[PDB]
Design an enzyme around this catalytic site. Sequence first.
Site, PDB file in Angstrom:
ATOM      1  CG  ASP A  36      70.188  62.145 -19.831  1.00  0.00           C
ATOM      2  OD1 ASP A  36      70.122  63.018 -20.715  1.00  0.00           O
ATOM      3  OD2 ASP A  36      70.580  62.376 -18.668  1.00  0.00           O
ATOM      4  CG  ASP A 229      70.001  66.707 -22.434  1.00  0.00           C
ATOM      5  OD1 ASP A 229      69.915  65.469 -22.317  1.00  0.00           O
ATOM      6  OD2 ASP A 229      69.875  67.496 -21.469  1.00  0.00           O
TER       7      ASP A 229
HETATM    8  C1  LIG Z   1      67.118  63.783 -17.105  1.00  0.00           C
HETATM    9  C2  LIG Z   1      67.433  64.463 -15.784  1.00  0.00           C
HETATM   10  C3  LIG Z   1      66.363  64.203 -14.735  1.00  0.00           C
HETATM   11  C4  LIG Z   1      68.818  64.067 -15.263  1.00  0.00           C
HETATM   12  C5  LIG Z   1      69.961  64.781 -15.996  1.00  0.00           C
HETATM   13  C6  LIG Z   1      71.325  64.644 -15.292  1.00  0.00           C
HETATM   14  N1  LIG Z   1      70.049  64.357 -17.385  1.00  0.00           N
HETATM   15  C7  LIG Z   1      69.897  65.468 -18.141  1.00  0.00           C
HETATM   16  N2  LIG Z   1      69.944  65.475 -19.470  1.00  0.00           N
HETATM   17  N3  LIG Z   1      69.701  66.592 -17.425  1.00  0.00           N
HETATM   18  C8  LIG Z   1      69.583  67.943 -17.973  1.00  0.00           C
HETATM   19  C9  LIG Z   1      70.864  68.722 -17.775  1.00  0.00           C
HETATM   20  C10 LIG Z   1      71.782  68.877 -18.855  1.00  0.00           C
HETATM   21  C11 LIG Z   1      73.005  69.580 -18.654  1.00  0.00           C
HETATM   22  C12 LIG Z   1      73.309  70.135 -17.374  1.00  0.00           C
HETATM   23  C13 LIG Z   1      72.386  69.987 -16.296  1.00  0.00           C
HETATM   24 CL1  LIG Z   1      72.749  70.654 -14.734  1.00  0.00          CL
HETATM   25  C14 LIG Z   1      71.163  69.284 -16.499  1.00  0.00           C
HETATM   26  C15 LIG Z   1      69.670  66.276 -16.117  1.00  0.00           C
HETATM   27  O1  LIG Z   1      69.456  67.031 -15.169  1.00  0.00           O
END
Ligand SMILES: CC(C)C[C@@]1(C)NC(=N)N(Cc2cccc(Cl)c2)C1=O
EC number: 3.4.23.46
Length: 387
Positions: A36, A229
């Site tokens: 991630d 991301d």
């Molecule tokens: C992969 C997930 C399950 C877990 C987590 C923390 N990782 C991620 N890339 N995102 C998406 C996100 C990006 C930026 C802000 C938020 Cl709030 C959420 C997530 O919610």
Amino acid sequence: GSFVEMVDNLRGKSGQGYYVEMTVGSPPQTLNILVDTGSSNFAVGAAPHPFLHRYYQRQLSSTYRDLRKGVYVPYKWEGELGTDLVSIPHGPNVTVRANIAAITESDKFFINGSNWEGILGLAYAEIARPDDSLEPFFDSLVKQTHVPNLFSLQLCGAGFPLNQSEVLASVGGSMIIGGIDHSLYTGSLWYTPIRREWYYEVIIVRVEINGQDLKMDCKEYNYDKSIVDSGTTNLRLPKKVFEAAVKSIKAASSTEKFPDGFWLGEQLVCWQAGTTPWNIFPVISLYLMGEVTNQSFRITILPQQYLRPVEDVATSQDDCYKFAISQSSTGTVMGAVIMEGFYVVFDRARKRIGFAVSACHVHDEFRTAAVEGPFVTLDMEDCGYNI
Ligand SMILES: CC(C)C[C@@]1(C)NC(=N)N(Cc2cccc(Cl)c2)C1=O
């Protein structure tokens, strides 16, 4: 390709995430870990959960160290902080002592059938929870070894639905830790500046749908930020940009009418096996700030990237997809479906992100994804958003 030991070390898919195998503790406990780039915590299931067939058992690790501190992450997961020895089997041949959030409670975090038991947050300490004092895994890796401060990701979408058995036996891509493997891409690598080290933040300066300029104030494209991301499935766009892009994509594909549910990314659309009309859908080009003043480059994706393969609710023989571009209230997010078209280099050492056409991107005989440059672009600094 000079990093054969790390090539093909990923499994998964855009909708459930891509994961790499890791070990934690002494003796080593093997776990599948979500890669991630949108978070900064190394967190692993550490207690029984309906969707986990294995979890970190701290009482079985002789090298486990309790930090006597909790961590709460609402997106949600809750855990207990500690450190332990961590390794990546199909990665650099090193073992490092890293922070580990042992997840003891979670809601809607673990995905049934994803096959991953934890998450590897590869972004910067600024967004680590509880605060920036909790050193991220990659920082620990670099500080404790000779591994170059750089990693690269080749996420490979299959271009079709993978059932439970197939997704477990299929190679989902590569995470090259400490280097760039040249067998994973074709053409040249183009670099865009990491604007600030927290998320992997970049600046988009122009957007085209089939060569047609979306013609929006470029600051709109980065409101309130644009990030890369791997932890997000879709290409997510700021509300106003999403509305303009969907209007343009609908116009380009107007020879076929799709239900509102499709454009909302909620319902699938299906075509008789092999007849998906890729050609009626437009390519999407995102221009990114280059490393040279007034210079930009563009990455171009195909509908084979933005239409996500999904199994028909009837498991029939139709080829079905969901529209993988959605609205965001938190800025642009270049998620997994966008990353699937490219080999992405996270060059932390040089504070830049590189893009090259992926050796595994899905395409057709008429069109391919592309990374092209350079283009003369003025006032790109004005495209960045300031709160
Ligand atoms: C992969 C997930 C399950 C877990 C987590 C923390 N990782 C991620 N890339 N995102 C998406 C996100 C990006 C930026 C802000 C938020 Cl709030 C959420 C997530 O919610």
